[PDB]
Ligand binder design. Structure first.
Ligand SMILES: [Cl-]
Ligand code: NA
Ligand code: NA
Ligand SMILES: [Re]
Length: 129
């Protein structure tokens, strides 16, 4: 599924991301835009052989099992395929663990480089939430 911007903001709020660990909804929407262009099915291979899955590009290195990332953990206890669903529950639940692990949203390189410090409220401007 490719979400619209306000549609994803709404879903994110429904699933409890709005101010999760102090990060406003706009942060999460901005991260999703630059990680996956709001496409739940996005996958991208990393140089180290791990793969990033879903709206928030969650990495098989640590967070999900894809059966092809040696020496890998599966800290969200889910098949990485679960992160590609039109239903965002799995991605949201796993992202709550990631953002809680000590470095906040800096875990998402595209958030650090493209969202951090910017007017992230713009991402939710006009949305009925
Ligand atoms: Cl957009
Ligand atoms: Na593996
Ligand atoms: Na980047
Ligand atoms: Re949902």
């Amino acid at each position: 599924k490719v979400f619209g911007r306000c549609e994803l903001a709404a879903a994110m709020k429904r699933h409890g991301l709005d101010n999760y660990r102090g990060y406003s909804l706009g942060n999460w929407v901005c991260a999703a835009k630059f990680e996956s262009n709001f496409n739940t099915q996005a996958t991208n291979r990393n140089t180290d052989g791990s793969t990033d899955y879903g709206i928030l590009q969650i990495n098989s290195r640590w967070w999900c099992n894809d059966g092809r990332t040696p020496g890998s953990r599966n800290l969200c206890n889910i098949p990485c395929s679960a992160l590609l669903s039109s239903d965002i529950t799995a991605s949201v639940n796993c992202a709550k663990k990631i953002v809680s692990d000590g470095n906040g949203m800096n875990a998402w390189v595209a958030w650090r480089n493209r969202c951090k410090g910017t007017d992230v409220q713009a991402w939710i401007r006009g949305c009925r939430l």
